[PDB]
Amino acid sequence: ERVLKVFHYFENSSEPTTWASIIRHGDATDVRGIIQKIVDCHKVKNVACYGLRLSHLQSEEVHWLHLDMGVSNVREKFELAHPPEEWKYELRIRYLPKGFLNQFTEDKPTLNFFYQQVKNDYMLEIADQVDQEIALKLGCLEIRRSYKKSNYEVLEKDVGLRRFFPKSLLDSVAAATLAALIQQTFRQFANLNREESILKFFEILSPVYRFDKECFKCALGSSWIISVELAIGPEEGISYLTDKGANPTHLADFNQVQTIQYSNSEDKDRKGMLQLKIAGAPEPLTVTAPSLTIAENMADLIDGYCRLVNGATQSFIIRPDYAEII
């Protein structure tokens, strides 16, 4: 047999970075299998929001693995390129329900998985470059949820304030001001249960960090190709941004998607074509991605919402078994 290490975001009260699961598969087991086996352990309801992303520790390229793919195969293919240690597999939420948050409230593990997941990308992307008042509050919402000076001393010596706050904040604020700041911030969130916390966490982040969509610089049209930035998400579905400051312009709700079809661009250039039949409209929507990988990642993303919006486990892509947890 063969084994696979999968990182995820289910809180197992250890070090945040090292939450993973180790699961055995076979020549037959697919991606849908692996994912499910994991989400079942944690009694997840919103099963269809999870996807499996393969990131290369050495570079930026990410490959989102489609559900009906063989683990042995996909695993094999990428090992011809690079050795097993250089790759990393992570379970993530990628396909958000129309009213996701409100919906996650009824599925705790997924609420928390999403909380941990986002918070992580936050500490990794915008924490250091956003308003102090925003950093504070967020940081404090973690401590609050996760849990006099006789308590603050333990935070810096024994716990480490770096876990909750960006070092851009920590070196720009004196220790006493922060102790004072916390108490007063932590004050107004002082009667919010873990749930109201988490929500409040997002309430505060969303107007500054966009985590309810994914954007893709790519081009539209078939005969006259125009460069844009697609915006796939649950509110807008499929849209293009004029200014990042202006709201996205709509193109299609996922329920209109009839088929998703992808190839390379017919020439030496390895740009990626992605063509979608959309109900009611005559001419298909033709996306040209910088590369086939970027195309795969969009097709995946789009397909995911269709499987979600409609209740179907089967895929919209036109295309030319035992998992054990240990």
From Swiss-Prot:
Please provide the record's keywords in A-Z order: Angiogenesis, ATP-binding, Cell junction, Cell membrane, Cell projection, Cytoplasm, Cytoskeleton, Developmental protein, Kinase, Membrane, Nucleotide-binding, Nucleus, Phosphoprotein, Transferase, Tyrosine-protein kinase
Stretch forming the signal peptide: none
Q: What does this protein do?
A: Non-receptor protein-tyrosine kinase that plays an essential role in regulating cell migration, adhesion, spreading, reorganization of the actin cytoskeleton, formation and disassembly of focal adhesions and cell protrusions, cell cycle progression, cell proliferation and apoptosis. Required for early embryonic development, embryonic angiogenesis, normal cardiomyocyte migration and proliferation, and normal heart development. Regulates axon growth and neuronal cell migration, axon branching and synapse formation; required for normal development of the nervous system.
Please state every residue range assigned to the domain named FERM: 2-313
Q: Report the protein name in the record.
A: Focal adhesion kinase 1
Q: Which GO terms describe its molecular function?
A: ATP binding; calcium-dependent cysteine-type endopeptidase activity; identical protein binding; integrin binding; molecular function activator activity; non-membrane spanning protein tyrosine kinase activity; protease binding; protein tyrosine kinase activity
Record GO cellular component, one term:
cytoplasm
Q: GO terms for biological process?
A: actin filament organization; angiogenesis involved in wound healing; epidermal growth factor receptor signaling pathway; negative regulation of anoikis; negative regulation of cell-substrate adhesion; negative regulation of protein autophosphorylation; positive regulation of cell migration; positive regulation of cell population proliferation
Print the domain comment field.
The C-terminal region is the site of focal adhesion targeting (FAT) sequence which mediates the localization of FAK1 to focal adhesions.
